[PDB]
Structures are given as C-alpha cells and as structure tokens.
C-alpha cells in the first residue's frame, strides 16, 4: 500500500505561521509518487497554502457539503471543490459529528457528492469510551463503515480513518497494538463487504494522537498505512512525521 | 443610515462566472463612503473574489464559527477571519437554521466571537408561516432578537436582517408594505431592550426575495435599510439593485 501522511490543521492558522510552516515544509525533499502527503487548511486559507506548498505536496479541505450548488448558505459544494482542483475532502470527522451533528448517513451522502465530482475522500469514524469499555467498538466500526463502503468505486481515491474517540480527550492512551487489532478488522470489513483485493488495497491512517515520538511505532504495524495528525502537523517537525512514512 | 446591499451568493459560482460577474459589478461606479455594498462569496472562493472586487466593495463570510482557534474540523473562527482582514460574517441565515439546526445560542455565541474580534455581522432571523397564520410574528422576533442584542455595542456594526420564511417557498409573497411594518417592529424591540438612539443607527435590512422590479418599493419604506439578496446577486443585473439605493 502507498503510506499516506495527513496534516488536519483543524481551525488554526494565520497567513503569517502558514508562510512559515510551509516553508520549512518544502524544505523536506520526498516523492509524492512513493506517498502521499496532503494538508488540509482551513477553507479560507486553502489558496495561500496551496500557492506556498510546492507541487509535491497534495491539499484538500476538512469538510464538503452533502448538497450540491445551491441555497445552502456557509456550505462549500463538492462541485466547486471540483472547479477549484481541491484533490481531496475530510468526511466523518468526529469534531463534525460531536459539534455538528454529522450522522452516519450525512457521512455518506457527503462521499456520494465527493466521488461524483472525482474527489478523493479521507473518510472518519471510531468509537467513543463508553462503547469500548462496553466491548462495542467492533459492533460500532462496523455499523460505521456499512454506513458509505459499498459507494466506494475505486480503493486509491478512499482512504479510511481510525479514530480511538476512547482515547481522545479521555486520559486513556491507545497502543500500536491495539490499533493494529482495530485495523485488521477494519481491513476484514472491507474484504467482507467489498472483496479482498479491495481491502488490501485501501489505505487505512490511523487517527488517534500522532506526534514524532510514537509514529514510527504505528506506521510500522501491519495494517495502519499512516496518519491523520492534527497538533503535531502545526509544527516544523511534522516533517519528521512524514520520514517516518518514506 | 447608511444604505446597506448585500449580496449572498449562498453556494454558487465557478472561478470563470466570479471573474465575469465581479468585473460586471466594478463598473458599476458608487461611493462606498455613502452606501455600503458588501459580497458574500464561499469561503473558498473568497480570496479570488476579494482580489478581483475594487475596495468599494467590501466583503465577507457566509458563516462564522461559534468557537475560536483549535480542534474544530471545518471551522472557520472569528479570529482567522479577522487575522485575513474579512470585514463581515453572515450569522443565522434561516438555512443554517434549518439544514444545520443552528439555535438562537449559537447565533450568539457567534455574535460574540465577531465581536470580540472585531468583525462586522449580518444577524439573520425571521418568523416562519405557522408562526405567523398564529398571529405569532412580534413574539417570535422578540425573542430571536433577545438572544443576542444585548452583546451590540457599536450600532454601526451589527446590521439585522428580517427573513419572511412565511413567504419564502410557502407560495406567499411579502408585500413591501408588510416588510415594512415588519422592520419597523424590529426596530421597536430594539428601541426597548438597548436604547433609542442605538434603535435609530442599527441597520434593517429586508432578507426576502429582492430582484431589479421590487428593490426600489423596498428601499423607499422607511424602515428598510436595504437588503441581503440572494439569488438576484448572482447576476449581472445585481447593480440595478445596487442603483435603487443609491
Ligand atoms: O487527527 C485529527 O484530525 C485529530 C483528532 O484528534 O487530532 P490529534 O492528532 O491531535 O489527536
Ligand atoms: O434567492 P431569492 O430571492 O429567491
């Protein structure tokens, strides 16, 4: 599988510390031909940041609206994500789902609109605490994932996200290992549902807190095919996060 | 007051029909120190369309976060927008209340952040057709507007916008008379809960249907300020609306 290394700035930036952090980003000399390396900006920030981050690098947006053009007021269409050449969308982020009420299906009429418009969608789910000290998180991953796997036409353009909700924000920390265990049976819902090439195929990050200490020991399990970074990819050292994938 | 015109292109537009309707709207030749005339494109589209605008025009957002900077995945905070130098930020909009279930607290907790960071805003609100077959429309407004008004200081800034949902796609139609009488119900309430002067300099805009063959009836009531227009502001055209406030 080719590793793919994502920078999920979330809500954060000024044009003066994106000048920065993109600078010292194109510093790091990688070939995108060998992984995947994509930042995602706050909407309003995608043009400075594409414009400053060489060709190498890949951008999306860490949202899309599930409706088309439209009178959809504050919503950004996957059909001018298309017209702008934005590669890539987050979809299914837990922040969109806590906040924001984003449901199972609003995740996959978001994919549906995202392929349509030959966007590549970075796709999010995971379960909370309670659910896993409940021994529900393969019940859980599972309900989540048959929520928009069967759209997905071809298994380079999704890329799928663990994200241990049971060890965001809780005081609990998840192990390598224990998010191995999540992503082979991740892997073994997709062979179920979509064949096993396809399963060996896709790409599935790992979503839990990334830093520079403790991904090389996720990356290099079996099924983890790389990353989904929030803080620590609001660093210069995010670059040694991407050498841990290269 | 100043005359305020804003155009809420909601989610539409191609790099290409930006390019031509901006440059369409610079010829148009007003004096942005008597009538205000703001654009709100996409967010992704902003920085083409602030770039391709004259600075008569000023510009803005479609929605603001509620929270600030940090973990909030495709969210755009007060303080980004302010650090870009965006001007305004449309908040409430009945389709964010609608699709997004956007509650009368989160329109002031957006409302506060703008403030806070020095932005101007466009608060939206409006009684919808049960409300009013209920004889409901002062009691629905009062407390839409209670929600947040106490957090205006300068009454420049925060410029109100009445939307009739009882006449949009209800088949019902608002005539110019009843905006008016509307508007001059929500200046009231404003007279009562802050002060008759701050009543006096806030702006009312009407944020039902405004085309080139009503804006004129709209503007010359007393208490109509000028409008928020959607699909109008996404033509040519847009600048005759434009004229009938000037
Ligand atoms: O990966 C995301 O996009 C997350 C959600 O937590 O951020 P962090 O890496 O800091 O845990
Ligand atoms: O966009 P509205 O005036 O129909």
Redesign the interface.
């Known amino acids: 599988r080719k590793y793919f290394v994502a920078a999920?700035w979330?809500?954060?930036?000024?044009?003066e510390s994106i000048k920065s952090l993109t600078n010292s980003f194109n510093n790091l000399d990688f070939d995108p031909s060998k992984l995947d390396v994509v930042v995602f900006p706050?909407?309003?920030?995608?043009?400075?940041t594409r414009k400053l981050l060489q060709s190498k690098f890949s951008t999306g947006?860490?949202?899309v609206?599930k409706?088309?053009?439209?009178?959809?007021?504050?919503?950004?269409?996957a059909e001018?994500?298309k017209?702008?050449n934005?590669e890539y969308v987050?979809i299914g982020?837990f922040?969109?789902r806590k906040?924001?009420?984003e449901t199972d299906e609003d995740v996959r009429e978001k994919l549906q609109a995202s392929l349509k418009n030959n966007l590549k969608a970075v796709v999010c789910f995971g379960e909370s605490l309670e659910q896993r000290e409940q021994n529900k998180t393969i019940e859980v991953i599972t309900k989540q994932v048959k929520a928009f796997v069967d759209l997905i036409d071809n298994f380079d353009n999704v890329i799928l996200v663990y994200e241990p909700l049971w060890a965001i924000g809780t005081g609990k920390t998840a192990t390598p290992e224990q998010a191995q265990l999540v992503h082979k049976e991740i892997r073994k819902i997709v062979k179920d549902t979509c064949g096993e090439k396809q399963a060996n195929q896709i790409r599935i990050l790992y979503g839990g807190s990334v830093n520079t200490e403790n991904c090389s020991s996720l990356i290099q399990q079996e099924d983890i095919d790389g990353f989904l970074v929030?803080?620590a990819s609001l660093k210069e050292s995010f670059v040694d996060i991407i050498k841990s994938a290269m």
Do not use: M, P, W
């Not at 409706?67 to 269409?77: C, D, H, I, P, Q």
């Open positions: 999920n979330k809500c954060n930036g000024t044009l706050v909407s309003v920030h995608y043009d400075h947006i860490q949202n609206s409706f088309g053009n439209g009178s959809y007021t504050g919503e950004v269409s001018i994500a017209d702008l934005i987050i982020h922040e969109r906040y924001f009420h929030g803080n």
